[PDB]
């Protein structure tokens, strides 16, 4: 009960108006601070026990940030737009050894978001669903997170079918982007962990803390 898309949309609008890898990592650290603010703007998120808020964010940060810059890169030709204002072209990511994953982002996420014209409200609702992941281990009350997730996709579907009545399969189409997001998210972490192991590629304090244990 109570989970209006207006609040979600607002949270989205309020938080966002040489080696490519290094740039992406710096941009990731920068966005992590903004992610915390975004979350606090999501209804009922702050009413959860602190430990649980920490658990949800540490579990979804990577997929949450990917979803954000992917949607922000819809107008981009063959690349993505970083929160720092920098552009990473497909060829550049390829010349850095990250072509495979980069291409997956463009093909499975950026491209599809553009084809269906996913709007900010839809983006926000999907990130809210990711944030409220009831499968996160350690949650003091998983059932509670489950309820929030349900209220979110309930408002999301309502939003759809009303704004896009002509597209009855839209709601399902948005949800079916999550499997790809989960996969891409898992792959980016692996790369990050390898970068941290090799030592190269400067990793800031916030990004580094997310790469902690568990």
């Amino acid at each position: 009960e109570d989970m209006p898309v207006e609040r979600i949309l607002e949270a989205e609008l309020a938080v966002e108006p040489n080696d490519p890898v290094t740039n992406i990592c710096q941009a990731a650290d920068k966005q992590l601070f903004t992610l915390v603010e975004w979350a606090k703007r999501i209804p009922h998120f702050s009413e959860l026990p602190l430990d649980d808020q920490v658990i949800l964010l540490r579990a979804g940060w990577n997929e949450l940030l990917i979803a954000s810059f992917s949607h922000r890169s819809i107008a981009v030709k063959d690349g993505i737009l970083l929160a720092t204002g920098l552009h990473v072209h497909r060829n550049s990511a390829h010349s850095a050894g990250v072509g495979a994953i980069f291409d997956r982002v463009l093909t499975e996420l950026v491209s599809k978001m553009r084809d269906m014209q996913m709007d900010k409200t839809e983006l926000g609702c999907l990130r809210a669903i990711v944030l409220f992941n009831p499968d996160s281990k350690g949650l003091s009350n998983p059932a509670e997170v489950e309820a929030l997730r349900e209220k979110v996709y309930a408002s999301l579907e309502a939003y759809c079918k009303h704004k896009y009545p002509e597209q009855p399969g839209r709601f399902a189409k948005l949800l079916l982007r999550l499997p790809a997001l989960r996969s891409i998210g898992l792959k980016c972490l692996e790369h990050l962990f390898f970068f941290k192991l090799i030592g190269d590629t400067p990793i800031d304090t916030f990004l580094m803390e997310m790469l902690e244990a568990p």
Binding site: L50, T205, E212
Partner: peptide, 11 residues
């Protein structure tokens, strides 16, 4: 554990 994150979520 999770020093930074907690501080930000608290304020």
């Amino acid at each position: 554990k999770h020093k930074i994150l907690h501080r930000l979520l608290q304020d």
